[PDB]
Structure 1
Amino acid sequence: MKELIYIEEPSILFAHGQKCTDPRDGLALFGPLNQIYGIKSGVVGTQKGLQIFKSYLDKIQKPIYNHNNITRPMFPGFEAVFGCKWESQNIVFKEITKRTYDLVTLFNDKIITANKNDEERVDVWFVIVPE
């Protein structure tokens, strides 16, 4: 017979100095620490992949409910949680049309062309891989 001690769960901080244990609820309640003004999303993929990413990014604005809302908290919507704009109509899209090497190289050189040559700024590139 041996004792099982309990360690008090650490509190991950959030906005306004408020702390909580679940990152989801803490984000959906108080929000993240530093406020970026928006996410200049970049996309690399086929046109169908662009349609999929745009539809999903539109859905992110709306709230999506888990099948067990008390076990895993639902999503309020991106602007509701983070307070930064990530709309789907202001995306920097780059269309594409040893096999691993050249498959990687297509995205590599297109992304480098976009980051280096293109004028539009991108905060993060969302490579939408095919299937």
Structure 2
Amino acid sequence: MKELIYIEEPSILFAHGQKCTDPRDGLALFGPLNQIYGIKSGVVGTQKGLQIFKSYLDKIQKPIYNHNNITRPMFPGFEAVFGCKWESQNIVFKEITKRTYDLVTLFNDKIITANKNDEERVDVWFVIVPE
């Protein structure tokens, strides 16, 4: 018949100095702390992968639904929550048309050439792995 103690759930800070327990709820209500102006997306992969990424990004912009919305919070949309623009029309694309090493090398060398030679700046590179 042992005592079980309670630890109060810590609150993670958000924008405007507000505190919420769930990162999802705090993000949806007040938003992230710092305001980056957008995501300079870079997509390296197959044309099919690029199209899939663009479609999923456009789906990300608009609000999307969970099956059970109370056990897991909604996603209002990237602009609504984080306040930065990540539209799919501003995607920097790199086409690809020991086996592990060379498959790794293909994407790495494409990203290296795009980061070194290409003028367009990419904040983060979304490696679309073929399946």
CA distance, structure 1, for counterparts of residue 78 and residue 33 of structure 2: 15
Q: Distance in 2 between matches of 1:74 and 1:99?
A: 41
Measure the CA separation in 2 of the matches of 1:17 and 1:50.
38
Per-residue deviation, residues 64-107 of structure 1 (Å, max 9, x unmatched): 11111100001100010000000000000000011000000000
Backbone CA RMSD of aligned residues? 0.4
Q: Which ranges of structure 1 fall in alignment gaps of 5 or more residues?
A: none
Report the alpha carbon displacement of residue 53 of structure 1 after superposing the two structures with TM: 0.2
Matched, 1:123 2:129: no
- Could you tell me how far apart the structure 1 residues matched to 2:128 and 2:110 are? 13
Cα deviation code 1:38-78 (max 9, x no counterpart): 00000001000011000000000011111111000011000
Percent of aligned positions with the same letter in both sequences?
100
Secondary structure at the residue paired with 1:9? coil
Number of aligned positions between the proteins: 131
Tell me the TM-score normalised to structure 2 length: 0.99
TM-score (norm: length of structure 1):
0.99
CA–CA distance in structure 2, aligned partners of residues 52 and 98 of structure 1:
28
| Structure 1 outlier segments of 4+, above 2 Å | none
**Counterpart position of 1:14:** 14
